[PDB]
Amino acid sequence: SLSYLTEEKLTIVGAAGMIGSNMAQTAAMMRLTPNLCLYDPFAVGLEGVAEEIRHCGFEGLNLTFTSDIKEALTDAKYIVSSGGTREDLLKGNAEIAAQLGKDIKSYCPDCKHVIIIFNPADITGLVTLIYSGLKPSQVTTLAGLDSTRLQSELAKHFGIKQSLVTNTRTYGGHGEQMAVFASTAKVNGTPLTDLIGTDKLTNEQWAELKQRVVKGGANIIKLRGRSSFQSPSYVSIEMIRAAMGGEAFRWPAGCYVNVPGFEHIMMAMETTITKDGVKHSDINQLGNEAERAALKESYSHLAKLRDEVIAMGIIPAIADW
Amino acid sequence: LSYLTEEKLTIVGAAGMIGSNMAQTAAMMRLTPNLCLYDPFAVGLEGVAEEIRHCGFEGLNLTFTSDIKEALTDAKYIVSSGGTREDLLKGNAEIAAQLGKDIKSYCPDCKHVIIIFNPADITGLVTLIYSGLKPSQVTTLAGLDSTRLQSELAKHFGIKQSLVTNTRTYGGHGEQMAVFASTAKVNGTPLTDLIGTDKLTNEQWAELKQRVVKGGANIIKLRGRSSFQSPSYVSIEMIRAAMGGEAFRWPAGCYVNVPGFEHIMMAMETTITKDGVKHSDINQLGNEAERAALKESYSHLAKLRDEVIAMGIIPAIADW
């Protein structure tokens, strides 16, 4: 085995669930830290999860579990949370995200990085950042699944090994609000934009393929009988590994953006997460002009949702940030 | 790192909670790019393959299928969680026989097979017999009783789990497990010097053992379903060892046929390597009292074996 990447405490919030439990197993396999702490309000489900992890026999693991948030966040340096009417779910998740920020502020204001994966992640991630008191470089959201699903759907269409479709990228919002930057991708060396609208990938096939990405989460539900839990788990934990100084993470992440044309928002971006946190590349040089316009469209929907949550009084007036 | 091998690994029962976790673990471990997922429930299976594809494992060449011939063709490694009491026994015995027949037809050159559906002493043995393989090529998952005993002892003493060393149960599982306490140390101190003392009383040890025996029922009470992460994780650790990665030394179920313990598959002191499974000398295992406990477990396993012979599924021992 490799040595553990760090001794600092990693806390998983939402650990009793199908996603959080898989995260626990993934973090332990990756040997990120021996000090892995599992938090969930659901104490009985949590205990069953911890018992399962203990029975894997991970060498050197110091697993802890708790339903007390102070205990869970004390000494925490990394945190990953899956602990999540339309207005009611929106408000409900924005409120749990604010409370997570306040808790980070009270119990671990020196936290290094925090990843929020519960939806709607543009709001939850931004609310957590604001209430947590952390720098923008310290908070990201899971946003890479649109890109891995695009990669998969392209590899299936072309009947080739998935890894041969390189640099597939969506930016902005997710699902219906994703912005596909096809100019970034190659299919076994050939630019995707040379293939779209040819006999090898017709206009209509491309539309249908994009729609299978948009509906990718519904499709897992229809096939598995429950929401996806292994992919969001694994990808999120690869993200926190990068933030902890491990192997770099090679897919878009959600991060804070505030530049002319895209002000005061959290969006899926071309990011790199390292021990120094997250940074994003220059939006003005992303893709081509048409793709940037699609990104602006996605931006406009995100900005409307942000303003709803300001109106609920949860996110402060932008002028007050 | 680099993939451990290019040879094909097939997971049978891949649509389930255990199988799907096995798929992710095998991909994470980079055992082989050629990971093949089989299950007769094609819709459930596709959803698992989709999740795995959406993790983005570099270089993975995932396939899935509900066709046993396609799944077993070119397979060199196989892990299966593809499973009245007499009816559950027979049904599982019959699926274990069909798996053996299938291996013999489609991949008689398979290197190693791990059977994890219960009752593993019977399923493992039936698969071995029907598969045509050597005894060094078939194992069953049998280590959770040892890891549970490690965890329960560490919880007792309030120390880090890895500091409880060399905890071992042999023989059957759960109610039929045989605890070999003489093998274990608690942070350097022989377990047998702790049992019956102030630091672990007679009654606390009885209760601790029972928490191991009922470990599976406990996970069900707590999670609301049977364990799936630990059986998956430990089993793929075993196949990694068979594929030539880090050796696997928790107990595994394997074929034993020696005086006092004839014609049976039992959890043993085993090592799995690129050369398959070997077990140590039973007569040197633990002390005389513990070997007697192990003989009791053997007696129960032998009765079960003979029931499956009487069903005409396992041939007469004289015909092996």
Side-chain angles (χ1 to χ4, degrees), chain A residues 18 21-22 25-26 51-52 54-55 60 62 148-149 156 162-163 224 226 228-231 234, chain B residues 17 20-21 24-25 43 50-51 53-54 57 59 147 155 160-162 223 225 227-230:
Chain A
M18 292 296 304
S21 69
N22 187 283
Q25 175 184 346
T26 300
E51 292 296 39
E52 278 242 69
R54 285 161 171 180
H55 304 167
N62 284 309
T148 63
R149 287 176 181 164
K156 290 158 54 172
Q162 185 172 333
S163 259
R224 291 199 81 152
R226 39 164 49 76
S228 64
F229 59 99
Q230 298 179 249
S231 54
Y234 177 77
Chain B
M17 296 290 311
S20 62
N21 187 283
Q24 175 185 347
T25 301
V43 165
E50 294 297 32
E51 280 242 64
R53 283 164 167 167
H54 308 164
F57 288 110
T147 63
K155 282 161 67 182
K160 185 175 68 189
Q161 178 167 336
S162 287
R223 297 201 76 156
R225 54 178 86 242
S227 79
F228 59 104
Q229 301 185 247
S230 57

Side-chain angles (χ1 to χ4, degrees), chain A residues 1 16-18 21-26 29-30 42 44-49 51-62 144-145 148-149 151-153 156 161-163 216 219-220 222-224 226-235 238 247 251, chain B residues 15-17 20-25 28-29 41 43-48 50-61 143-144 147-148 150-152 155 160-162 215 218-219 221-223 225-234 237 240 246 250:
Chain A
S1 299
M18 292 296 304
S21 69
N22 187 283
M23 292 176 162
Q25 175 184 346
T26 300
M29 289 174 65
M30 283 183 183
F42 182 37
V44 168
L46 183 52
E47 184 179 350
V49 177
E51 292 296 39
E52 278 242 69
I53 305 300
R54 285 161 171 180
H55 304 167
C56 288
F58 290 109
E59 203 114 22
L61 193 65
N62 284 309
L145 295 192
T148 63
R149 287 176 181 164
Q151 185 191 50
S152 176
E153 296 295 325
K156 290 158 54 172
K161 180 172 71 189
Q162 185 172 333
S163 259
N219 182 62
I220 299 312
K222 169 197 323 148
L223 305 168
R224 291 199 81 152
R226 39 164 49 76
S227 315
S228 64
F229 59 99
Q230 298 179 249
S231 54
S233 163
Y234 177 77
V235 173
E238 288 182 296
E247 184 168 350
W251 297 104
Chain B
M17 296 290 311
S20 62
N21 187 283
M22 286 200 288
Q24 175 185 347
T25 301
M28 285 174 66
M29 288 183 176
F41 178 36
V43 165
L45 181 60
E46 180 182 352
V48 172
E50 294 297 32
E51 280 242 64
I52 301 298
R53 283 164 167 167
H54 308 164
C55 296
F57 288 110
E58 205 140 14
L60 190 71
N61 191 37
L144 295 189
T147 63
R148 292 174 179 157
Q150 190 192 45
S151 171
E152 299 296 324
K155 282 161 67 182
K160 185 175 68 189
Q161 178 167 336
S162 287
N218 185 57
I219 301 308
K221 323 188 322 74
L222 303 174
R223 297 201 76 156
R225 54 178 86 242
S226 287
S227 79
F228 59 104
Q229 301 185 247
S230 57
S232 162
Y233 180 75
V234 178
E237 274 186 307
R240 175 168 69 176
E246 175 84 13
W250 289 109

